[PDB]
Swiss-Prot record, chains A, B:
Molecular function via GO: chromatin DNA binding; damaged DNA binding; histone demethylase activity; histone H3K9 demethylase activity; histone H3K9me2/H3K9me3 demethylase activity; metal ion binding
Parent-record interval covered: 11 to 340 of 523
Organism the protein comes from: Homo sapiens (Human)
Subcellular location: Nucleus
Function description: Histone demethylase that specifically demethylates 'Lys-9' of histone H3, thereby playing a central role in histone code. Does not demethylate histone H3 'Lys-4', H3 'Lys-27', H3 'Lys-36' nor H4 'Lys-20'. Demethylates both di- and trimethylated H3 'Lys-9' residue, while it has no activity on monomethylated residues. Demethylation of Lys residue generates formaldehyde and succinate.
GO process annotations (BP): cellular response to ionizing radiation; chromatin remodeling; double-strand break repair via homologous recombination; inflammatory response; positive regulation of chromatin binding; positive regulation of double-strand break repair via nonhomologous end joining; regulation of gene expression; regulation of protein phosphorylation
Statement: the UniProt record of this protein carries the keyword Oxidoreductase: yes
Lineage: Eukaryota, Metazoa, Chordata, Craniata, Vertebrata
Coiled coil: none
The JmjC domain, residue ranges: 136-302
Cofactor: how bound: Binds 1 Fe(2+) ion per subunit.
Domain JmjN: 8-50
GO cellular component: a single term: chromatin
Entry binding sites for Fe cation: 182, 184, 270
The protein's name: Lysine-specific demethylase 4D
Principal location listed in the UniProt entry: nucleus
């Protein structure tokens, strides 16, 4: 077995190796990368997503989300308060203001300490889930808007044509903006490129130990757990590395910097935070190995959790009716 | 001036000519094709959208629309009554049933006569605007899911990056299903491929005479006109070729058959109907020549009309606030 400790692996493809996305994902998994739940891919030195980021200030963040925390420093939930629209230019200026800017710190470890100590006492604003892409149409390699669709993958594997289209999303972040513990919809893969700005710190639980995190979550969020058998689908729960360690949950951490890709693998629980003003782009994808995870993915049917129809309809026909009632 | 009578032109590209989409659209316009408002493109004999259509019955039509008419035979409006979900297999069976099937007829002209005589007395069900594609991912030429985006076109022409993603839609039709008189959102181009089944008959007004149609529409639909300065954006008004002829409106007609593409050009008003069970796929696109049409496109701000944000925001900043109130 490759990567038996489930370490987060870092890959440095050559430009030749960067030319076939599916092939390289499969190569990564041949080295056991998937066992960590997360991998970093450093693009070839001659690769670029686009020429410059000088012309992005007029992008509109239609519904910025103020992330309001409740609980304790290491165990909290966050809810999203909708704010008025602003441009990326206005958002960037807000992120760099005295109220929201990254504080003085010695290094990543000091910043991480400050995040978990102080996160709940501030309510940063996140420009998340904006449909769009910052890849140049002429970028041929690892262009997240030119990947094959999950609908075509399901068709290729299962022989069924389905409706739906999957496209990338942009995430404009600032210091303390947070992504809660979750796996992807239908336990899909995700790929995330950090286009510009300050880093993004990730935490991840190996897929083989995901149920351990779920068990801890039910204990730490009893109200949420009673409300929904798959409440982590609501994407609101945060648990710090110290609390995970206290409870024996196996996990790893890594910091993503501008110009780097992160891939999350099926049923790899992850969470994290942004260091300062940045912009990432992400999309879900599938491989043949995903199908069996799709079939077993837990579903939120309480109505709180936000193409999905067809995947549940085909892979989980028994769940489909009740899941559809929740929607 | 090419094509001064504004005739609908039909093109037969070679496989070599079929290899550069933008180039061929530009070639078509060099021959005056755009003046008609609509063109037909017959693909090369060796081209195909996909291998077979044997595996499409499990596609879900989440919200089939029953098209209910009001008015007179040649001048009517239609509203869409939402029906319960059905699969394409179930829809196809309904379309072929005695209640909904194409009636006996001698030819296209007889069927057209029957449509305009009898359309208002039936309420056919249309599986319209389903996000998805039936093109094989391996189809390299004129794959409507692999076109360059309107957002990238605007960026390339105007130097502004914007949010948004544009993807194709599927249309499952039956006899008498109808598309009302309209131009595309922001007076964009559209491209439509008829994947399978019975034909689709199109009517079109040359872009240079669009305001003549608008004037007639205001006279024929006085209530709708008073309610909204751009009510044709609601996509509910039908006017027959006989009534257009009586009122001196220049127009043309053509019937699209399975395996053929239709392109609508900026500000080319069009309408039509399906002959029987079929499936079409369509998407909007842009070229450099569209920009000036985008800037002048009329907007519905009464709230009735259904990526758009950014195009109005950048090309029509003066209209943006009031348009946003309507939404
Ligand atoms: N929202 C997310 C979800 N999964 C991974 C990363 C993020 C992010 O916000 O960067
Ligand atoms: N809905 C439409 C809009 N424009 C052109 C064609 C159609 C169609 O229904 O085929
Ligand atoms: Co994620
Ligand atoms: Co149209
Ligand atoms: Zn739930
Ligand atoms: Zn209106």
């Amino acid at each position: 077995a490759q990567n038996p400790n489930c370490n987060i692996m870092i890959f440095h493809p050559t430009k030749e190796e960067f030319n076939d996305f599916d092939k390289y994902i499969a190569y990564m998994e041949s080295q056991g990368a998937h066992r960590a739940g997360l991998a970093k891919i450093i693009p070839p030195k001659e690769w670029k997503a686009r020429e410059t980021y000088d012309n992005i200030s007029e992008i509109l963040i239609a519904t910025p989300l103020q992330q309001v925390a409740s609980g304790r420093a290491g165990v909290f939930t966050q809810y999203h308060k909708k704010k008025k629209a602003m441009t990326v230019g206005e958002y960037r200026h807000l992120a760099n203001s005295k109220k929201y800017q990254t504080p003085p710190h010695q290094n990543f470890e000091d910043l991480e300490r400050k995040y978990w100590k102080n996160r709940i006492y501030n309510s940063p604003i996140y420009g998340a889930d904006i449909s769009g892409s910052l890849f140049d149409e002429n970028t041929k390699q690892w262009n997240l808007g030119h990947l094959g669709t999950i609908q075509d993958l399901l068709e290729k594997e299962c022989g069924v044509v389905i409706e739906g289209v999957n496209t990338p999303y942009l995430y404009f972040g600032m210091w303390k903006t947070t992504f809660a513990w979750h796996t992807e919809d239908m336990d899909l893969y995700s790929i995330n490129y950090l286009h510009l700005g300050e880093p993004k710190t990730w935490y991840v639980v190996p897929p083989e130990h995901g149920q351990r995190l779920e068990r801890l979550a039910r204990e730490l969020f009893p109200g949420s757990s009673r409300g929904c058998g798959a409440f982590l689908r609501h994407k609101v729960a945060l648990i710090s590395p110290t609390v995970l360690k206290e409870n024996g949950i196996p996990f790893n951490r890594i910091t993503q910097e501008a110009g780097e890709f992160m891939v999350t693998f099926p049923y790899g629980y992850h969470a994290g935070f942004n260091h300062g003003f940045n912009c990432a782009e992400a999309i879900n994808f599938a491989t043949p190995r995903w199908i069996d995870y799709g079939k077993m993915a837990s579903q939120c049917s309480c109505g709180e959790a936000r193409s999905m129809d067809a995947f549940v309809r085909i892979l989980q026909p028994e769940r489909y009716d009740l899941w559809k009632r929740g929607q």
